[PDB]
């Protein structure tokens, strides 16, 4: 029975992608899903509910890197940034959801729980990076007296920057993935060997 | 008489900022402007017209760096990127206009001329950077066999990245301007001393 549960969520990704979350209604879900208006309701209370639930399934799909593997911390930092970026711009459920969440989700008071979930993602992330760079210095891989904070701001900016050039421009339409990786690596060097990122 | 011309444009920046360009109408301009509906019409045909005109005044306000000054080309590249970023996030007419143009301007077929103007800005810019980095290598300031294209993609990403952290987060709410400059400089080093940005 709960297999039909999948039917609405994947149903939903499209519905929400097709029209915004504020304008989409609970019947229209059952339509695209193929189910009866009651069925959908059975499993869920509100469309908002169906929505949080669709977002969870899709975060369980984000690959979790192994924070504790015998490699350089920056090797972990990069792999994740490269795995994750991939998922944002390849064509699975995760890329859908994020596009739903950021673009097709109004700032109403109703979408508060959506908004919160989102920021949770943003923070979970921003902090993960902050952990990796921290370790690198501690692990000797990067200059003690590296200005950690500004450093993240640097990496985090760079990411977002190329994120916006994949979607949406044709600048990395040719070989994208080895190239981004080059940019990321080159981003990581500057932490390593660049004066202006140390403190005081 | 044409001094009232200013009155509508500055009038406009607010009106368009207040409600989008698609929803704003030509009477409402005269309202905020203080002028009569006929006056506004006298100087301009369409609201779209008033709008292109508002955008021009505000691009004449973008500082043009001296492409031909006896300094390093990257000194020119940075100054401009630092002057210009400033104008996007300090509180003059230019910052208004851009916010109007990017956020509060629908993708309708009507706003085509607006859209075009915009991209013109984007291209004028992207090309300016491409000129500066080009020169640097030619001028010996950067590795011949530097992969020019990927390099810009790198700088252009980084910019956009910090642009999005000024607006909109509190991450550079403390000292922003010396810090961004640090990031930019550190961005420029990586072109200089980073393997992954050369070709072949």
DSSP of A156-183: HHHHHHHHHHHTT-STTSSS-HHHHHHH
List beta partners, residue A198: A146
Of B184, B118, B133, residue with least CA distance to A157: B184
What's the rounded Cα separation, in Å, for the pair B110 and A95? Answer: 31
Of B139, B126, B122, residue with least CA distance to B69: B139
What's the rounded Cα separation, in Å, for the pair A133 and A155? Answer: 10
Residues of A in contact with B189 (CB under 8 A): 190, 193-196
Experimental technique behind these coordinates: X-ray
What's the rounded Cα separation, in Å, for the pair A171 and B195? Answer: 21
B10-37 core/surface letters (b: 16 or more CB in 10 A; e: else): bbbbebbbeeebeebebebbbebbebee
Instruction: Say if CB B54 and CB B14 are below 8 A apart.
Output: no
Of B110, B13, B4, residue with least CA distance to B61: B13
What's the rounded Cα separation, in Å, for the pair A94 and A55? Answer: 8
CA quadruple A103, A92, A43, A38: dihedral, nearest 10: 80
What's the rounded Cα separation, in Å, for the pair A93 and A108? Answer: 24
What's the rounded Cα separation, in Å, for the pair A98 and A50? Answer: 16
Q: Is B127 on the interface with A (CB under 8 A)?
A: no
What's the rounded Cα separation, in Å, for the pair A109 and A111? Answer: 6
What's the rounded Cα separation, in Å, for the pair A33 and A10? Answer: 8
Give residue B171's Cα distance to chain centre: 22
Instruction: Say if CB A164 and CB A146 are below 8 A apart.
Output: no
Hunting for tokens 């004028």 — which residue is that?
B124
Strand, coil or helix: A191: helix
A161, B165: Cβ pair inside 8 Å? no
List beta partners, residue B146: B198
List beta partners, residue B198: B146
What's the rounded Cα separation, in Å, for the pair A65 and B4? Answer: 61
Task: Please identify among residues 138-157 of chain B the ones whose CB lies closer than 8 Å to any CB of chain A.
Answer: 150, 153-154, 156-157
What's the rounded Cα separation, in Å, for the pair B156 and B125? Answer: 10
Instruction: Say if CB A128 and CB A80 are below 8 A apart.
Output: yes
CA quadruple B98, B102, B108, B110: dihedral, nearest 10: 10
Residue of B nearest to A160 (CA): B161
Number of domain units in chain B: 1
Tokens of B7: 């009155």
Domain containing A55: what range?
1-200
Cβ partners under 8 Å of residue A4, min gap 6: A33, A35, A39, A43
Total residues belonging to chain A: 200
What's the rounded Cα separation, in Å, for the pair A197 and B11? Answer: 43
Closest in A157, A172, A186 to B196, CB measured: A186
User: Which run of H or E residues covers position A99?
Assistant: helix A93-102
Give residue A127's Cα distance to chain centre: 13
List beta partners, residue A146: A198
B186, A186: Cβ pair inside 8 Å? no
Tokens of B181: 């400059």
Q: How many CB atoms lie within 10 A of CB B58?
A: 21
Q: Which long-range contacts (CB under 8 A, 24 or more apart) does A67-72 make?
A: A67/A131, A72/A136, A72/A139, A72/A141
Tokens of A200: 């005081």
Q: Is B168 on the interface with A (CB under 8 A)?
A: no
A4-43 core/surface letters (b: 16 or more CB in 10 A; e: else): bbebbbbbbbebbbeeebeebebebbbebbebeeebbbeb
Q: How many CB atoms lie within 10 A of CB B57?
A: 17
What's the rounded Cα separation, in Å, for the pair A136 and A197? Answer: 15
Distance from CA of B191 to the nearest CA of A (A): 8
B111-127 core/surface letters (b: 16 or more CB in 10 A; e: else): beebbebbeeeeeebee
Strand, coil or helix: B72: coil
Instruction: Say if CB B49 and CB B163 are below 8 A apart.
Output: no
Q: Is the dihedral of CA A111, A113, A114, A118 positive or negative?
A: positive
B190, A190: Cβ pair inside 8 Å? yes
Largest alpha-carbon pair distance within chain B? Answer: 65
A183, B159: Cβ pair inside 8 Å? no
What's the rounded Cα separation, in Å, for the pair A61 and A64? Answer: 9
Burial of B178 (0-12, 13-18, 19+ CB in 10 A): exposed
A61-100 core/surface letters (b: 16 or more CB in 10 A; e: else): ebeebeeeeeebbbbbbbebbeebbbbbbeeebbbbbbbb
Q: Which long-range contacts (CB under 8 A, 24 or more apart) does B140-148 make?
A: B141/B72, B141/B73, B141/B74, B142/B74, B142/B191, B142/B192, B143/B192, B143/B198, B145/B198, B145/B199, B145/B200, B146/B191, B146/B197, B146/B198, B146/B199, B147/B197, B147/B198, B147/B199
Q: Write the DSSP symbol of residue B1.
A: -
CATH number at residue A68: 1.10.357.10
* Resolution attained, angstroms: 2.9
């Amino acid at each position: 029975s709960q297999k039909t549960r999948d039917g609405i969520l994947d149903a939903a990704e499209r519905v929400f992608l097709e029209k915004g979350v504020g304008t989409t209604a609970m019947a229209d879900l059952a339509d695209a899903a193929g189910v009866s208006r009651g069925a959908v309701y059975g499993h869920y209370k509100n469309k908002i509910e169906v929505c949080l639930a669709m977002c969870d399934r899709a975060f369980g799909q984000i690959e979790v890197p192994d924070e504790n593997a015998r490699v350089p911390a920056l090797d972990i930092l990069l792999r994740a940034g490269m795995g994750f970026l991939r998922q944002c711009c390849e064509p699975g459920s995760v890329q859908r959801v994020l596009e739903i969440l950021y673009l097709k989700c109004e700032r109403s008071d109703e979408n508060e729980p959506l908004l919160r979930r989102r920021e949770l993602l943003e923070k979970q992330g921003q902090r993960f990076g902050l952990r990796q760079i921290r370790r690198a210095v501690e692990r000797g891989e990067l200059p003690a007296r590296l200005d950690v904070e500004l450093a993240s701001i640097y990496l985090q900016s760079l990411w977002d920057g190329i994120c916006g050039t994949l979607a949406w421009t044709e600048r990395l339409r040719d070989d994208p993935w080895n190239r981004a990786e080059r940019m990321f690596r080159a981003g990581l060097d500057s932490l390593r060997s660049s004066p202006y990122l140390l403190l005081a």
